[PDB]
Design a protein around this ligand. Structure first.
Ligand SMILES: NC(=O)C1=CN([C@@H]2O[C@H](COP(=O)(O)OP(=O)(O)OC[C@H]3O[C@@H](n4cnc5c(N)ncnc54)[C@H](OP(=O)(O)O)[C@@H]3O)[C@@H](O)[C@H]2O)C=CC1
Ligand SMILES: NC(=O)C1=CN([C@@H]2O[C@H](COP(=O)(O)OP(=O)(O)OC[C@H]3O[C@@H](n4cnc5c(N)ncnc54)[C@H](OP(=O)(O)O)[C@@H]3O)[C@@H](O)[C@H]2O)C=CC1
Ligand SMILES: C#CCN(Cc1ccc2[nH]c(N)nc(=O)c2c1)c1ccc(C(=O)N[C@@H](CCC(=O)O)C(=O)O)cc1
Ligand SMILES: C#CCN(Cc1ccc2[nH]c(N)nc(=O)c2c1)c1ccc(C(=O)N[C@@H](CCC(=O)O)C(=O)O)cc1
Ligand SMILES: CN(Cc1cnc2nc(N)nc(N)c2n1)c1ccc(C(=O)N[C@@H](CCC(=O)O)C(=O)O)cc1
Ligand SMILES: CN(Cc1cnc2nc(N)nc(N)c2n1)c1ccc(C(=O)N[C@@H](CCC(=O)O)C(=O)O)cc1
Ligand SMILES: O=c1ccn([C@H]2C[C@H](O)[C@@H](COP(=O)(O)O)O2)c(=O)[nH]1
Ligand SMILES: O=c1ccn([C@H]2C[C@H](O)[C@@H](COP(=O)(O)O)O2)c(=O)[nH]1
Lengths: 516, 516
């Protein structure tokens, strides 16, 4: 029948595609994509046609595109014979007669101009859309990509890439007419039927039935079945798995959860920063807690003083009293994360004491082994100290991490987290250890690698159900970028002002109460 | 023309299906499977036909099967019109006219007798094979399932199930005809080509390019693309993953490996024991090293005396020397795990010293919490004590573990393993911590749950390449069962003889040298 597909690069929030007759931006990988995509064909004796409005024709210098035939739509341009790789038409519908004839034309692409896009869509001429989402807002646009008609559904979203600090995506939308998101399903009737029957026979007894694929009403952007490349699906899909399989269970806080044991999440950090886009995340507070950790600081007031209250709850007199630490000052949390990082096995007295020299400095050693022996398999940082647990406001959650220097020269990080509050703590942990890995990488002379998080008790607190369903209804946007303004000499030296968060265009923040 | 599939239950090694006119076993779930499968149909106005040899007809008492038509092949049986649900034919070929006609007959099943299977396969009448593999050998068989023709390929392998301590699967075989083993690829031209093109543009900058799908020549039983349910694939595919992506890198050993970071494996422990069948695995030494840890013993002699030599290489006078620990008696391994399990943070001297009372007894604490506070999110056991690494013959590989009591009353286990020798240590760790979980579960009144292994440095030593590729050429068999003959009072009371390993029919041992 001959496929007709739109190909465009529009800004993530406004769908801005042009300014004063030009592109709002310069991203070569995107042009390479345009070239590969429009050039891609089966028959060597055929060519693809690239339809475009006249202004776009002007915008590219009125020079032909190799191996392809350009079809310009113009009421004024003359139909001449000079170039046989460029041809003119008076309206879109007529040019569409690439279909009813030229058998030398394999595929058709609508290659843009807002005016051309809008018609092709209005008149139901396109089957597919290749959308390069560019994280560039707050800049002038005078040309837009129309809003994608509801008859289209996304089927692929690649990971975030980066060019000159600009984050971008690649999505594919397909028009689906007439008529499970599980990839290993709907593949072969006999396999699906057999597994289904085996499941009826055994019950909880078949491990698969303990790991049911999420029903679509809890599956984010469910139409994307085989192309969920964007690594934010790694967190959304874990949410879906616990919403689908979570056992309902009581716990120390009195606010029950839905709980599954033993999931994982991997995020790339070479091209982008894993800061969730489906909800606005408080990154300043994350950074402050991280730096607070690095300095082996356990004084909660230092956090509060900077208007960061994540540790207030577990620092209160009331709480400290409840767990048997009524002897502490307000906000003395005991030998937690920071202390175990800088002074492992050190004898904790109070937050006011000087501990320089005491305990084992894991962090310092980590940076030394990382520099001097990179391929060593012992780059570990731990916070689990059986002898210190009872003195901690809260036992270590992000419990152990290990660090792996690539042959590429990048720093990758693994973290086991015994207990993970998916709504409120996970987004934090992900970003936090993404930042730490980048800080470690800079002081050791490496580039950021990959981040993998392995979870024990992965749960959602029962008062976050409607909030996370809300979140799950939001399709993800390209991840932002995070850059350091200066190269520090000591990891303890980083400051908020040193952090540059580039291109973060999240959805509204979603309120969620933390369980004390 | 419609579908003809075989349904058979045969023993793992010899494919025995009968003895003295009956089955060698009684596994009701398999009868339930047989029933689901041969009853399975779309058109509510048609029925399926089950073809069987006369002897099989005798073996089921000559009583019709509900909702189905039974086709008996016999030279002697009278062709009566009496029961419209049972029909007789003089030969298998004539019977196949179920195709040509009886549009009441939706699908056809060859339901067996060795004589009937062997004919159906020889004359090319069957398209599919449903094959329940039973782990029973060393019992009498007089009837067998023919050897599956090479024109058939395996497309599914369920997990191992257990009935009356008998391990069993089911798997599907499909007949091949003309025509990527990757699940997500091959679903849409548009998506595969986009991902491909994107890969070309970005190269190593696209995470996916850093985790390529393994090429078939190194992927176990590649024809099974969407049905690799047998949890032995969790191990085998990790092997395949590093063969395909592993980075060549040197290490302290002197024997270079191939390395990838952050991987995971999952194993069920409810229906079976995860002891690799693609190679014979030494379970006894494993158990002996395990019970050794449990007791807190750091004395390497005790294992040698029991003829277990896994800790010799790293306990010799020459080795303890190269790492500056010669002031130590030979085979005095220092406070590794065991000491860390029973006396975490205790002050270590020699192995002969009496440590009762020193250090934190994590194991004891574990068991007392698993009992009194199952839902607790802190069941942790750690062996990574920075304050003690210097004096350990070797730093801890299986570094931390977490334990999770389901509402189902089972005990699941998570282990982070900083470094993992895939050819030598991994098969051991999977079994080791499987056993430890069953021990803990018996002792605490629970049933075995699931086992997940999170790995940091996942590698293969370069001298194991031939052995591993050999292993990768062996198709998995059902896992064996592992039961305790008695209920111990304390976990320190387990003894080799208390363990009954039922139904293990591994492939031959594969010799692999351990890098010191
Ligand atoms: N990021 C991206 O993906 C892309 C962005 N762009 C940007 O978009 C902008 C150009 O888009 P836009 O401003 O909409 O201009 P267009 O490229 O749509 O071209 C408009 C011209 O096309 C002809 N035309 C349009 N409709 C008709 C019709 N119904 N009948 C006959 N001729 C018609 C007219 O030419 P005439 O006056 O001769 O009749 C009109 O002047 C530029 O800034 C460009 O940089 C362009 C392509 C891609
Ligand atoms: N594990 C499993 O899935 C199954 C196992 N079994 C076991 O298999 C055994 C039975 O198999 P088997 O011993 O091979 O006997 P079969 O069940 O295959 O039946 C053999 C009979 O079928 C008829 N027959 C066979 N070939 C022909 C032919 N070419 N022309 C005409 N009639 C033919 C003959 O009946 P006649 O004498 O009337 O000519 C022959 O005696 C039993 O022990 C049963 O328990 C059976 C089914 C399934
Ligand atoms: C992990 C971690 C760090 N931590 C430490 C921390 C301490 C105790 C915890 N307790 C529980 N039950 N869950 C947690 O995630 C948790 C986290 C956090 C603590 C609180 C919040 C939280 O309340 N966040 C709110 C705050 C709003 C804001 O940041 O301005 C949020 O909206 O996100 C986040 C992180
Ligand atoms: C994990 C662990 C325990 N350990 C501890 C241990 C210590 C140092 C190591 N060093 C290296 N490089 N790899 C290891 O797996 C390793 C394992 C083991 C050590 C050796 C064998 C081993 O060589 N087994 C032989 C033969 C012994 C047998 O047949 O029983 C084998 O061929 O399988 C297994 C486990
Ligand atoms: C019409 N237009 C505007 C433009 C710019 N970027 C886009 N990007 C996308 N994703 N989609 C578009 N339609 C698109 N259009 C174009 C078209 C072609 C070239 C161009 O130079 N193309 C060469 C570029 C090749 C290269 O640089 O590697 C080609 O090979 O097709 C530039 C702008
Ligand atoms: C021919 N035969 C021997 C037998 C036994 N086990 C097998 N198992 C398998 N997987 N495949 C076979 N062909 C097979 N055949 C049979 C056939 C039917 C029944 C039988 O009782 N079937 C009932 C069983 C119903 C039930 O137990 O739930 C049915 O509904 O089909 C027993 C033995
Ligand atoms: O870095 C952190 C700190 C705490 N929590 C959450 C996990 C649990 O919801 C709660 C800890 O409670 P316990 O598992 O100790 O009961 O705080 C996190 O998710 N990440
Ligand atoms: O349970 C274990 C014990 C040791 N090893 C292997 C992993 C490495 O091959 C080697 C440890 O080397 P280092 O991490 O110390 O470099 O021992 C395992 O795989 N599993």
């Amino acid at each position: 029948e001959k496929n007709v597909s739109i190909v465009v690069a529009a800004s993530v929030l406004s769908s801005g595609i042009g300014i004063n007759g030009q592109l709002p931006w310069s991203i070569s990988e995107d042009l390479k994509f345009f070239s590969k995509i429009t050039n891609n064909k089966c028959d060597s004796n055929k060519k693809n046609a690239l339809i475009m409005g006249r202004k776009t024709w002007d915008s590219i210098g009125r020079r032909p595109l190799k191996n392809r035939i350009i079809v310009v739509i113009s009421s004024s341009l003359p139909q001449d014979e000079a170039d046989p790789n460029v041809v003119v038409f008076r309206n879109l519908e007529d040019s569409i007669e690439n279909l009813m004839n030229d058998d030398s034309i394999e595929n058709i692409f609508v290659c843009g101009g807002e005016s051309i896009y809008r018609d092709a869509l209005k008149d139901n001429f396109v089957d597919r859309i290749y959308l390069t989402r560019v994280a560039l807002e707050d800049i002038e646009f005078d040309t837009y990509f129309p809003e994608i008609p509801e008859t289209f559904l996304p089927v692929y979203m690649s990971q975030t890439f980066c060019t000159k600090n600009i984050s971008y995506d690649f999505m594919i939308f397909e028009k689906q007419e007439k008529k499970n998101c599980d990839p290993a399903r709907g593949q072969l009737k006999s396999i699906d039927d057999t597994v289904d029957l085996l499941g009826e026979i055994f019950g909880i007894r078949k491990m698969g039935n303990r790991h049911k694929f999420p029903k679509e009403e809890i599956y984010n952007t469910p139409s994307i079945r085989f192309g969920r490349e964007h690594y934010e699906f790694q967190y959304l899909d874990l949410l879906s798995r616990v919403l689908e399989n979570g056992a309902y269970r009581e716990n120390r806080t009195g606010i029950s959860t839905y709980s599954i044991f033993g999931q994982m999440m991997r995020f790339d950090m070479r091209e982008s920063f894993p800061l969730l886009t489906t909800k606005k995340v408080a990154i300043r507070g994350i950074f402050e807690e991280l730096i607070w950790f690095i300095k082996g600081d356990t004084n909660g007031n230092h956090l509060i003083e900077k208007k960061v209250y994540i540790w207030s709850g577990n620092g209160s007199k009331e709480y400290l009293e409840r767990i048997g630490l009524g002897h502490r000052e307000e906000n003395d949390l005991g030998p937690i994360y920071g202390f175990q990082w800088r002074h492992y096995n050190g004898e904790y007295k109070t937050m006011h004491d000087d501990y320089t020299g005491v305990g084992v400095d894991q962090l310092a050693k980590l940076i030394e082994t990382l520099k001097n022996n990179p391929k060593d398999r012992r780059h570990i940082l731990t916070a689990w100290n059986p002898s210190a647990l009872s003195q901690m406001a809260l036992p270590p959650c992000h419990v152990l991490s290990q660090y792996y220097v690539t042959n590429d020269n990048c720093l990758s990080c693994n973290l086991y987290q015994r207990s993970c509050d998916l709504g409120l703590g996970s987004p934090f942990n992900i970003a936090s250890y993404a930042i730490l890995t980048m800080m470690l990488a800079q002081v050791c002379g490496y580039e950021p690698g990959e981040l993998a998080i392995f979870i024990g008790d992965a749960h959602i607190y029962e008062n976050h159900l409607t909030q996370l369903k809300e979140q799950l209804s939001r399709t993800p946007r390209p991840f932002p970028q995070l850059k350091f303004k200066r190269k520090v000499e000591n990891i303890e030296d980083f400051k908020w002002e040193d952090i540059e968060l580039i291109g973060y265009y999240p959805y509204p923040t979603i309120k969620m109460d933390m369980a004390v």
